[PDB]
Amino acid sequence: PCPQAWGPPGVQYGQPGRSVKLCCPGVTAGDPVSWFRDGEPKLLQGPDSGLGHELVLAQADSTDEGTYICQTLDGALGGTVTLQLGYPPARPVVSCQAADYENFSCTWSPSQISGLPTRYLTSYRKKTVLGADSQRRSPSTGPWPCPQDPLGAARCVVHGAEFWSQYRINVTEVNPLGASTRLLDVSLQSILRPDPPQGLRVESVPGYPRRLRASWTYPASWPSQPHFLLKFRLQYRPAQHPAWSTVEPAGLEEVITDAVAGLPHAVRVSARDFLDAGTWSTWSPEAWGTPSTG
Template sequence: MSNKSSNTQQFRLLYAHVPTGSRKHTILKMPDLVSCPGGLIVIGLLLLLSINAQSELWTNEVSDVQYRRLGTNVTLVCEAARGRSSVEWRLNRNSLLPWQHHVTSAGHLVLMNADHNAEGNYSCHDDQGLHIKTIRLHLGYPPGLLSVSCRVPNHSLVLCSWVESVKTGLPAQYHASYRDRSQVLPCELFPPPQQRCSIKEPTMWEPYHDINITGTNALGSQTTIVRLRFNDLLKPDPPDTVMAQGVPGYPMRLQVNWTYPASWPNDPGPFPLRSQLHYRPKNSRIWSTVDSEDNQALITDALAGHAHQLQVRVQDGHNSDSQWSDWTPIMEVEPWAGSTAQTTEEAPVDYNDTDATILPTIVEEPNGIRNVVLLALLAVVILVLVSSLFIIMWVRQRRRANGTKQELTLMVKMKSMPI
């Protein structure tokens, strides 16, 4: 008896969770069913099926999805409410609506200055609680103008992306194209949620291109048009790999090699790249620059025994109006340091000019240096004596000229005197 009483109590607890509308379908006239554990299992399964059926019913109840603008008065219409004495509205099954509202005489629900808190599933019911209709409400804004930017990594590809100036809060669809002077061509969209498109084989030679992107959501659409010149936007990616090392035997040289970006054609013949390398001793503020028409360069004036920092960038070789790529990340390298056992006489002479001819070193003896100094002093003494003689002669000559002039003046005066 105790087991039967316990089973009956468990059945009552399970029965209390069965929705009221489904209790009439529950088998209650079989007391022998609840007296065994197998009967309780059957009842439990019936309870779960009932709950799932109610959840599925609520999901399928949504008969309308509406989109409205944030911050406005929103009216939800319950068409089947006409002719009924009263209508009750519920939000997510809750009869207490958490927003300022009122219900019109026709049974329509008006939400005042609705914001995101007012979103959800609204259901209308008659005075008997019978469900009439469910509306799912989403709030947001219509699309605004887009901020569009495009990147041209090579001659055969243009990548454009955009950012919304207005956060609409609603899903949007985009249509993208571009137009030159003679035709309109598509800009292929990337899969959502990416807001990008690509143009393959663009007409680079045209003087201008109009990028046209239209955004559309449930509240409206907006078109943004941007005029660009692809030639001016051409900007290669930075080189992929940069390698640098010291040159054995030359403590002032660094050999630098790099690979062209993967986004540039494998055969750069038709579209060559010019390169620029800049470098500096570590902790220095002054960069030195080397231009190269190839993918390598030789630094000949490195500071021996010091680590150096270097970066590389590239530009389209035919289009001087195009943009330089970004610099590669800074890398550090040290010149060749040599062996401590190697004498100074064994190290090769290094010159800044790689084509310079190495001249033989002139070794001067100490006596030769002394003779050179004596000859220089003698030359200075002779120059001083010659200069002094020249000045003395010039002074004497000037005095003689002044004396002759005075004599002539005196003679003229004497002749003019009466006898």
């Protein structure tokens, strides 16, 4: 009767400078047993007289890392344990994003690896406003799992998320010794950022030496829908000039009217929900065009 293992069935873990308490796996509780370090014959001692069912180490230093053997005083090999040293987990770093009104996604990286089997528990809840306690769960606003599809990708997925509610995501890094939960407040309406438009093209307009026509499409991750349009902001700049000029086109087209005649112009655009929800997208790839002559 000892703590069931963490990973493999006969290995236990500990942190340096702390206390670690090893048990002999295959020995009846109450039988006295002896402990040795691999390759070194000195009999180790312990606060419990010196012969119990469980070895204790107040040392926990690097010299204590290796393979251990336990045997009963009769000589019978009662089992083997491996001591791997490490450190408690650091707090993970979490960011989220969302390119549609249904799902959003968050990612995380360890701030420290420790050398320990650092697996992750991920969950999130919908905060309410009554606030009598943390228990208002008839629809069960508790912890909901973020399934990891090929059990990596380092990202939670939310299907069927509430667009306007605010969520507190609970990412907990865990190792065999504790937790350091990261909590991140996220509202879909504040965090949202669409991808940039694709296929930006600029064309001359015959007859007008200082107008250019820019066209582009929605991003593919954003389905065109009458409820959430997007506003756009277009920028243009003549070659060698340092400062961008900004316009806010209606729709998927924009006639630029102050282009310098006969000069290449760079153009880039970004997108945001038309009701100023979330934040502006990253800038599009630069596109170049040249006004017609005459």
